[PDB]
From Swiss-Prot, chain B:
It is found in: Cytoplasm, Cytoskeleton, Microtubule organizing center, Centrosome. This is Gamma-tubulin complex component 6. The lineage of its organism: Eukaryota, Metazoa, Chordata, Craniata, Vertebrata. Component of the gamma-tubulin ring complex (gTuRC) which mediates microtubule nucleation. The gTuRC regulates the minus-end nucleation of alpha-beta tubulin heterodimers that grow into microtubule protafilaments, a critical step in centrosome duplication and spindle formation. Component of the gamma-tubulin ring complex (gTuRC) consisting of TUBGCP2, TUBGCP3, TUBGCP4, TUBGCP5 and TUBGCP6 and gamma-tubulin TUBG1 or TUBG2. TUBGCP2, TUBGCP3, TUBGCP4, TUBGCP5 and TUBGCP6 assemble in a 5:5:2:1:1 stoichiometry; each is associated with a gamma-tubulin, thereby arranging 14 gamma-tubulins in a helical manner. Gamma-tubulin at the first position is blocked by TUBGCP3 at the last position, allowing 13 protafilaments to grow into a microtubule. It comes from the Eukaryota. Belongs to the TUBGCP family. It is linked to Microcephaly and chorioretinopathy, autosomal recessive, 1: A syndrome characterized by microcephaly, cognitive impairment, underdeveloped retina and choroid, and epilepsy in some patients. The more anterior parts of the retina, near the periphery and pars plana, have a grayish hue and diminutive vasculature similar to retinopathy of prematurity. Visual impairment becomes evident during the first year of life.
From Swiss-Prot, chain C:
Its main location: cytoplasm. The gene is MZT1. Required for the recruitment and the assembly of the gamma-tubulin ring complex (gTuRC) at the centrosome. The gTuRC regulates the minus-end nucleation of alpha-beta tubulin heterodimers that grow into microtubule protafilaments, a critical step in centrosome duplication and spindle formation. The lineage of its organism: Eukaryota, Metazoa, Chordata, Craniata, Vertebrata. This is Mitotic-spindle organizing protein 1. Belongs to the MOZART1 family. It comes from Homo sapiens (Human). Transmembrane segments: none annotated.
Curated annotation (Swiss-Prot), chain D:
Component of the gamma-tubulin ring complex (gTuRC) consisting of TUBGCP2, TUBGCP3, TUBGCP4, TUBGCP5 and TUBGCP6 and gamma-tubulin TUBG1 or TUBG2. TUBGCP2, TUBGCP3, TUBGCP4, TUBGCP5 and TUBGCP6 assemble in a 5:5:2:1:1 stoichiometry; each is associated with a gamma-tubulin, thereby arranging 14 gamma-tubulins in a helical manner. Gamma-tubulin at the first position is blocked by TUBGCP3 at the last position, allowing 13 protafilaments to grow into a microtubule. GO terms for molecular function: gamma-tubulin binding. Ubiquitously expressed. It is found in: Cytoplasm, Cytoskeleton, Microtubule organizing center, Centrosome. It comes from the Eukaryota. GO terms for cellular component: centrosome; ciliary basal body; cytoplasmic microtubule; cytosol; gamma-tubulin complex; membrane; microtubule organizing center; nucleoplasm. It is linked to Cortical dysplasia, complex, with other brain malformations 15: An autosomal recessive disorder characterized by global developmental delay, variably impaired intellectual development, speech delay, facial dysmorphism, microcephaly, and varying degrees of cortical malformations including pachygyria, thin corpus callosum and subcortical band heterotopia. Most patients have generalized seizures. Component of the gamma-tubulin ring complex (gTuRC) which mediates microtubule nucleation. The gTuRC regulates the minus-end nucleation of alpha-beta tubulin heterodimers that grow into microtubule protafilaments, a critical step in centrosome duplication and spindle formation. Plays a role in neuronal migration. Its main location: cytoplasm. The chain holds residues 150 to 872 of 902 of the full protein. Transmembrane segments: none annotated. This is Gamma-tubulin complex component 2.
Amino acid sequence: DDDIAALVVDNGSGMCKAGFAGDDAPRAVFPSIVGRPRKDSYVGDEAQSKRGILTLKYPIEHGIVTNWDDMEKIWHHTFYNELRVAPEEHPVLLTEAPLNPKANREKMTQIMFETFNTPAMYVAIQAVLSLYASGRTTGIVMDSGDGVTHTVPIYEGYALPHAILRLDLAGRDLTDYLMKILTERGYSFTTTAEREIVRDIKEKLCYVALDFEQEMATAASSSSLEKSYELPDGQVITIGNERFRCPEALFQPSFLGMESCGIHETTFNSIMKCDVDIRKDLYANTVLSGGTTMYPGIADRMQKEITALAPSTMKIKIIAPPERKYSVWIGGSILASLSTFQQMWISKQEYDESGPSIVHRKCF
Amino acid sequence: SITQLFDDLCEALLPAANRKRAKRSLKKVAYNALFTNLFQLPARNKILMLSFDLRVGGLGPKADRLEELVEELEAVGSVLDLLVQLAGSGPPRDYFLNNKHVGRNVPYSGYDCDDLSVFEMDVQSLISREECLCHSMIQETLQVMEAAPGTGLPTVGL
Amino acid sequence: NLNAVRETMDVLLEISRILNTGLDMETLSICVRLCEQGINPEALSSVIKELRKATEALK
Amino acid sequence: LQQSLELKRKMLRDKQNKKNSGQHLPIFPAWVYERPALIGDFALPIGTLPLASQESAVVEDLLYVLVGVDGRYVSAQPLAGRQSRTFLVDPNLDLSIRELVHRILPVAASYSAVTRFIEEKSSFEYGQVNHALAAAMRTLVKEHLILVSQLEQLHRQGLLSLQKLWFYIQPAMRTMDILASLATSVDKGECLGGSTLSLLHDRSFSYTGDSQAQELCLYLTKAASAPYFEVLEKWIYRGIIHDPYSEFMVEEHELYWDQRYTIVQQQIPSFLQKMADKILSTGKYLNVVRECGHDVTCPVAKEIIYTLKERAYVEQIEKAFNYASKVLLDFLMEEKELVAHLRSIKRYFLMDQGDFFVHFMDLAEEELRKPVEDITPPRLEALLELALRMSTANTDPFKDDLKIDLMPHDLITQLALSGLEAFSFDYIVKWPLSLIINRKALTRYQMLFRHMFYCKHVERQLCSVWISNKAQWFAGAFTLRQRMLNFVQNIQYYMMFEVMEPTWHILEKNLKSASNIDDVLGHHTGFLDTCLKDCMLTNPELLKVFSKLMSVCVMFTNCMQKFTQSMKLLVSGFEATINKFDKNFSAHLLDLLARLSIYSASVISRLDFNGFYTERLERL
């Protein structure tokens, strides 16, 4: 190149993504599973392989850390076994979840400087870092992950946390609710492995439609909507009518029995807390993001809701990348490539001279 | 995706026959200048303003071609504001002007004699192309006739 | 839409060719898509102009 | 001179003979060869002038002979046996200057055999890699002529002398002596295609640490790998190649899986020597899919480039090998199944069904019994077509492949006759599928079925004499019948339920987990060949005792008896046959069990279940 190489390692909420900044795809995708018997010093590929008598746990699930030992441990074993590189030749951009406390930022930076060992560091809010890859510094990001989902409004490179609305409904609630309805109707879901496999089936094959009612009536008069998949496991679970209406609980809390805010109302309440002069400027760049693009078709519903959200006397102008599975990755990958970003990136010496809390101060 | 759209911009505008580290370093400059701007009257009117400057320098039907094409181009407005900035920077016959012996419905205006002397400059341009070529054959060898052994030749460098 | 967007791309090719822009067909389609995302044109005008100086010092 | 016509005759005749495409390559006009003025291979007293004037006269003459135009008082007369042209220097020169003259003069001799090289290597008969080989030795000769003229511009000002001139040409005889060294190796013997590219892989790695010569040899081989890359941009990614110059490693033949395309052992370059077999393989798979319709266009089709020792031209061949033969395999498994073919071989040859065989055996009993030279083939084909339609194994459209096949042998291919011991099976395939299961596999299948006929025969033969006897006091034949049933019933469980079927269910999974067509054909030939060797055909002592055993088996059960020769339908005459056949059977079965024991077990562990004839006696 012309300068010292970059590194981006973000421990997300269902996965750890690593690699060198300057690639469209991450170099390495790992699980964020933490091993404990239901290994104990080996985490990642080995813990996911010995799963079945080993618990599945993520160190962050609500967008705030539930157990600090697990995060510090997966972070240290990320640096020691998964990559095995020299720290002084790889500055790392870390990304914590949005709406993390200031003490969490202090905890992340002490841990990144001591157990993880980096020569200069930066920790950022997630969806903002993703939007900086979308070629603008203004916009609204609806980020939907494994653990939670949240609409981050971001104007001029900065998210006000008062207008970031956290919503529980995510892929975990979708899988949990699938398990609940199949086992309530009568189906053996039994073990944690079969749980993971049926989650794989929902993630990959599922047909998601924009109209439920017409497709429901056609499937109820003559069912042919199915498409069978028989794995090396041997299980055959498919039904066409349930798989498009199972994620409808995102805008319909009464499908479980829940009383909650829906997704359109969440983004409505979020846009209410942004100023109306920047509402147009933000509305001129609406992004599609989130790992739920493993099957596209929820994204069409998402863009219909953002068209209906603001008043239509101006046409939607939507930034739709060819892939948004790696949205958080391509987010940090643009940032660590920048050379002017080294002046807003904090060193070890500034971290030592002005306390550990200056990572909350330097980070805008 | 957008991290590739500046890189594909970087490849197409780079020709070929170092220059293998330079592409990857120039997409870095592409992002480094994207966020220098972002930190710190219709669209068709600017096209009408450039067509006017065509008309002052002659060439009327060309300006009329520009405008008949932007009237159907109204059916892109964020592309033209970029297009007008690269319309000034560049890279680093017909017989019906003066003929009335064709047709049956053909104008009567008689003589011109106001640019018929600039109808002989029409021929001066053609002979001035084929005389500048013979000036660019005599210089590229007169730079060779006066030279010294191995000053531009690396064959003495072996 | 698709036939009309083919026609509007063709007309957009013609008016940038007689104005004798250094760009070509492919880079026109790239720039058109970049403005179709909502990216500021004022920033793309810098990167094309600095690329088209910086790529010649390499050759 | 004269030699070149004989060379062109030989060259063009080889080009013409190897394939019908690309014949009558062009020839240059005759004025090209006659005139030595497309080639550069070339008043004042010499004895009466003072020494300084002679120093000037010689620097002039040397400046003249260095370009292809002749020197004025020095010239080249014919080469005649040397590869470089001898010169004739004008006498009466000072002997101090005469030494220096012959220091500068070898450069013109190392230039005499470079234009004479080019004007016999840009020719069509000499190839189309030698075209661009001598189309990059032209550029250098132009640079040579540039340097002499800069020297002439100095010489006009009276400041070029013998010493300066002798200095100036020393960088120019490390780029002309090397051309006149390669030129006399490419010329000696036929060097075309990849053969030249190995000759410049052995003289680009003879001075690759000089760094003055390394650049030049890399320029020479990067400027003629480019025509060779074109032919490698055809054969790898499609099957279609024509190549009039026939300098490619894979030569085309109108002749199929081993003769339509065949590697020549010297037209290969050195750096593709290890990957040659892969090149031929990749093209052949695309040809056999291209006669079946399907996609032959590869997306791995990319342009080929040369780099010093580093491979991206020894690399794309493997990523084509790992694409083409899986498009063929994935074509086969979802369109024109080979799983159904192998099942329909299993259905018949290994006697899978029972109904088709019991119907078939009862209906064709009389006709198989009839001797040959009295046999009628269309009756037996009609009998087969009925025997299948009655059974519930009539669910297959590959039934038409079966013919009433004739075999005038009785396994005499593994050293008079009747219709029972001549009837054989047959299985046909189309010409694209003939490659998969071929003449060898079919012949081995036939030998296995001819063995299986005996077993199915002797089963019904024991059954007949057992049901007819049941006397209700007699048990003398009931012991020998029992002894035969033991051996030819536990061979029945041993072969089919252990060697064949549990392996076969594993193979029906292994064939779908093989990587390419080569892997599939490995697994299937393994299964067939080793399981036929496991049967009683192939042994170190050959088990002829088994043949004699089955013969006395059929004799005792049916040929002597034939429904007790209407005894109740004796004199104890059959008891002597019982004793004779018992002792012969004991001898033959003992020899067989000893032979099975002494070399290599599982069938013996089963016939000797709890101790029963583990030892009746040892030999002699």
